[PDB]
């Protein structure tokens, strides 16, 4: 079946928050014909196969997500079915072109290690940046807490891209930090 886009986190005002635009029964029929008609809006889109949920995040007009969610699926669209623009196993990394409707978040040009995570809860995480591509969080927090928010941003202080997020590193099944695909990455693959 197609990925199918079932909501989206909202961060255009001072909260952020989930809305999510579709149920699963309206999931299944759009996972199963590849059209899907509903309205898209914002950076962030909640995306779902048949068996798990997770994000997607548009940065310079490509919506990327995980490849370890998306596998090598369609996009469901307007249109019909959209092949993966980008897919890159190595790298966990697959891109679609933006939907018509969606925005993409401006890439961080800042270097600002102060970062905020997006999870499919639409709470927002302060993020330390540790690297080339890892994250330690402030609080940490259990692995099922970040589960199903790989594929959402990491956010510098004005609100831009700095990766997207994809793996937790977990002991003792807290995770401590977070490993992300640095917009950088993105870039090198466009
Ligand atoms: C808990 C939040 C977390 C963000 C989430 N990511 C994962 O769970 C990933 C997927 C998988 C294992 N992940 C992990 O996070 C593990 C885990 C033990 C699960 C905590 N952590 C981990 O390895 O730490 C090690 C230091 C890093 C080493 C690097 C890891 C490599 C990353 C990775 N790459 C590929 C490339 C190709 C593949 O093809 C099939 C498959 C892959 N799988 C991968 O890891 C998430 O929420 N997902 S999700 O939303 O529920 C799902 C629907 C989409
Ligand atoms: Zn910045």
Same mark, same amino acid.
């Given at each position: 079946? /197609?990925?199918?886009?079932?909501?989206?986190?909202?961060?255009?005002?001072?909260?952020? !928050?989930?809305?999510?635009?579709?149920?699963?029964?309206?999931?299944?029929?759009? %996972?199963?014909?590849?059209?899907?008609?509903?309205?898209?809006?914002?950076?962030?889109?909640? &995306? /779902?196969?048949?068996?798990?949920?997770?994000?997607?995040? %548009?940065?310079?007009?490509?919506?990327?997500?995980? !490849?370890?969610?998306?596998?090598?699926?369609?996009?469901?669209?307007?249109?019909?079915? &959209?092949?993966?623009?980008?897919?890159?196993?190595?790298?966990?990394?697959?891109?679609?072109?933006?939907?018509?409707?969606?925005? %993409?978040?401006?890439?961080?040009?800042?270097?600002? /290690?102060?970062?905020?995570? &997006?999870?499919?809860?639409?709470?927002?995480?302060? &993020?330390?940046?540790?690297?080339?591509?890892?994250?330690?969080?402030?609080?940490?927090?259990?692995? /099922?807490?970040?589960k199903g928010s790989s594929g959402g941003p990491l956010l510098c202080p004005a609100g831009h891209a700095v990766g997207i997020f994809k793996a937790a590193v977990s002991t003792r099944g807290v995770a401590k930090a977070v490993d992300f695909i640095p917009v950088?990455?993105?870039?090198?693959?466009?």
């Open positions: 079946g /197609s990925v199918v886009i079932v909501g989206r986190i909202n961060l255009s005002g001072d909260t952020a !928050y989930a809305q999510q635009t579709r149920g699963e029964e309206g999931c299944q029929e759009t %996972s199963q014909t590849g059209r899907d008609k509903n309205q898209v809006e914002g950076e962030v889109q909640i &995306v /779902s196969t048949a068996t798990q949920t997770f994000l997607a995040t %548009s940065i310079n007009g490509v919506l990327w997500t995980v !490849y370890h969610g998306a596998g090598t699926r369609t996009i469901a669209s307007p249109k019909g079915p &959209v092949t993966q623009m980008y897919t890159n196993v190595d790298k966990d990394l697959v891109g679609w072109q933006a939907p018509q409707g969606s925005r %993409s978040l401006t890439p961080c040009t800042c270097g600002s /290690s102060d970062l905020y995570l &997006v999870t499919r809860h639409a709470d927002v995480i302060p &993020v330390r940046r540790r690297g080339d591509s890892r994250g330690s969080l402030l609080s940490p927090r259990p692995i /099922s807490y970040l950088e990455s993105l870039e090198t693959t466009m």
